[PDB]
Point group: D6
């Protein structure tokens, strides 16, 4: 059971999300982007993109990639 | 009768919208985005996106998702 | 004859536009957006979107919807 | 109670959708478009856009506009 | 009173639209495009774009331009 | 445990996907779209969009919505 | 000979452009937008859109519309 | 006076447009594209793009570039 | 050394690409899409998207995801 | 002097373009796409994309990449 | 040999780029835009668009147009 | 073995990325852009685009081009 998504983080702050993700995935390379940002298709097993809203809350389920 | 949309909130401030939505749906995870922002198709029964205008008023009918 | 568009407001300030629209349509729910913003297809008989330019002047004919 | 949306038509054929909509709204001007097509913001009280999928089934809730 | 828009043509066939527009504006240069097509901002007093749906019916109000 | 996604269907034909989804969710309203198609944010608990590739194989994880 | 475009204004400031356009077209309704902004197809004989760059210089030929 | 645009060709067929352009600009490299197609910013003094509609009529003013 | 990309397949046919990929990754779920198609960010360790050109040749480096 | 662009091929057929490019760059991996197609930023020293128009003529300067 | 592109300016500041371009093309009308900005197809022999990055460095080869 | 990509820089600051890239490629012309920015297809063997997130960390694998 590999932890690959954090549905429990939707609506939480980016600071709380970073803390949780690094506890579950200490190698995570955390990227913080506005919702709607276009990204590439290249997969990175250690990257976790956090898509944030106007108040810097997690707006979409974080996933590895 | 499940409360899934708030047409009565269009034109209201984000503060008033948050207060109303949390009264009707105490588990709501409220996300605040500019109008026009592209989002994912993943459904979250407890998320309510608020799409706001230049004056932080609700610009589209809030819906669960 | 239902007032549904304000061609006379193009180039006017948002403050003047709001004043005129509310005189003609006292129930108007006025939304202020940058020109070019993508919106939904849902119709709201009482909403009037004002699309503004860099100087907060009305850039497109306001219409109900 | 004005009939303005047909959630019951999602997944149905365009022929069945047209028949139902014209029964409920005999003045309907029915437009048939692929899902994802960009449209204008102009409101037409008698227009009903049907957004269809690859098999010509209704893919989104038809609404007046 | 210059005829610049044909709201009465929404939902009609392109053949019927062409016939009506040329009666009202004999100099019209009629262009037939799919709904959603991006066009330029250049204005042509004699051009009338007809935006058509999957069944070649007029999907948006024809306007001069 | 509500069945809301079918990761096991990626790469399978649309016919096989429809058969599996209707077994798991007999009320499913199945919509078949090309990959990349833009859709609305409205949630439909009984809709399952199938996004297909050039060979009509499932290209993305089907999800309810 | 109707003045409908100002190629001579490309690269000039918005202040200088406004002054020239109003001399040539005293009824002009001047709209100031960033380059690349999407606009509507509706034609307004008295509107002149000025598309400006990062330094508020005219980046495209102003035209009536 | 360099011939750089053919407003007189809007609404004409691509065959008639090609004939006229090659008479005025015998070195023209004529490219035929659907309206709305995105192109590059590279300038080619001898290229003339013809943007055509559903009936292969010229939909926008041809220009050199 | 996990095989995750096939730069050697650019320009090859989709049939040859499928044969090579399945030799290197027998569990591959092969998806065939036109170049430029927008996809989701969800990662699937067993999916390989093949982006093809007008002649069904591989146009971009296939990668797992 | 490395041959990296073929401005002389604009307006020529794809067959003639392929013949010329392979004479100048025998290792070329030739990709044929419609004008306007979005591609990735990954550089391939041996790939040459040919962007073609409705008549399969070269519409943009071919370049290596 | 007409100077129409400045590959040597990529990565340089906008101030240095302006100085070089005006030395080579004293009539240049210099426009400064963010990378990615959509522009029109109209050609202006004296315009040079500078597309800049987050640090106001030249991000793409300046070209006349 | 030509150094053309820096997967090890994902998640690192732009300052650290610049230092590493210039050590490996002293001729690098470093461009700093927001994630999602559209760029041209022109290849520059000495350019390295750094796509950064809201916190100015490298969000995508830097590559030459």
């Amino acid at each position: 059971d590999l932890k690959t998504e954090w549905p429990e983080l939707v609506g939480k702050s980016v600071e709380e999300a970073k803390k949780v993700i690094l506890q579950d995935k200490p190698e995570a390379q955390i990227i913080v982007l506005p919702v709607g940002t276009i990204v590439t298709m290249e997969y990175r097993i250690d990257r976790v993109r956090l898509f944030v809203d106007k108040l810097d809350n997690i707006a979409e389920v974080p996933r590895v990639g």
